Each structure stands twice: as structure tokens, then as C-alpha cells.
């Protein structure tokens, strides 16, 4: 899985 660009470090 991959997070939305720029949200990859959201908790």
C-alpha cells in the first residue's frame, strides 16, 4: 500500500 503523496508520514 501507498499513501497519498505528502501524507506518507501521517499517524
Amino acid at each position, epitope marked *: 500500500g*501507498v*499513501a*497519498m*503523496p*505528502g*501524507a*506518507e*508520514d*501521517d*499517524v
Partner: antibody
Amino acid sequence: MKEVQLVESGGGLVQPGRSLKLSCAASGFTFSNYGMAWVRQTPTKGLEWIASISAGGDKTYYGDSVKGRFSISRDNAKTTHYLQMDSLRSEDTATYYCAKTSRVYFDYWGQGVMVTVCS
Amino acid sequence: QFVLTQPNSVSTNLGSTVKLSCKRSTGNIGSNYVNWYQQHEGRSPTTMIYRDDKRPDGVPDRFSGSIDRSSNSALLTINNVQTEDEADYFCHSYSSGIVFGGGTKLTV
């Protein structure tokens, strides 16, 4: 139990080629636990994503429109993030919204601030 | 980078069921999460659906999202439409960049 609130400041009128800095003050959550973003809107062109900056502030992303002209940053000890806008163009006229991310989407949005670039 | 295509305008009668469509141009609609935002005239967008089909608290049950892979599209369904639902609706997804559909203006 806290209501999340994002508050843009800055913007207004500006000449082309010149610069403007937008601010977003964020409240209601642990600021450095979440990415922040800027999305702009016009009545005919809809929403366009402009820039994003990761939670720790070490990674920035930009839409095609603004690559190399806009720079996004954040001051975590101030719960605020910024959009520095250089080399402004007439077609940058838009309502600019700040937004918070929650992994896979934008969960809360600002009020929107109007930026008017003169011909 | 793909595009998300929504009809410009949709009309329905009150109490009916309306299906707002969001077609992805290249690649699979099911590859990345689809989210839907509502924007009333003069207001900020607010989340109606996140992660394809989850309702934020305070969003009424009659809003529901889904993914129709056969037409490579996402669907925002509104059951028993009220006049308060008249707004602009944007779908949203991503891959390497962030993509918004053009928005569907709902009238009733």
C-alpha cells in the same frame, strides 16, 4: 473532542512576476503528526492540488502548474504552514485553500483566501 | 497522470435516488482510494466519503460511496434526495500526483 480548524491568512492583490506568502494556522490536532497541503479553486476549472508537505516537513510535492515557482514549508513549533508564491501569473488567480491530510485523503479544509494576480 | 471525469450537471427529483459518477481515464479505479467532497455555494469543501465508502461522523446515512470496476468509475449514491443536498460534488484520488474530478453540480 477538539474541533479542527484551519485558518488561511495573506493573499489579496499582486502584480505578475512578484511574490506572495500564504499562511495557514492549524488547531485541534497534533500538528506534526499530519501532512499539510494547498489546493486552489476557480469557478470554471474546479479544484486543483497545488502543493503538499509531509508530516515531518522533510518532503515536499508540487502540482505541474507550480513546479519550481511555489515552495511549501511548515513551522511545527508554530502549528503553521506556508505557501511561498513566486513568479506569479495571471492564471494563478484563484481561491487558495489549506488542507490537512489523513493518510489517503484531505480530512479538513480551510476557509479559502482569494489571490488576484493582475494582468 | 490520470484524469477523473464527472458530469458537469445532474438533476433529480426530491425523494429519488441519484448516482453521481466519477470515471478514471487510465489505470484501475480500484488501484487507489477514492474520496468525495461536498462544496456548497460560497463554502469550503467537506468530506462526504473517504476510503472509497466510509462516512465521516455527521454525514447522513443516505450518502454512500462505492467503486464500480466494470465502468472504471466511483459512484456517490444519494438516497431520498433532499433540497439541502444541492451542491457541487468532487471526487478525488491519486497515484504519483493528486487528482480531482471536475465536479458535478447537483440540482433538485
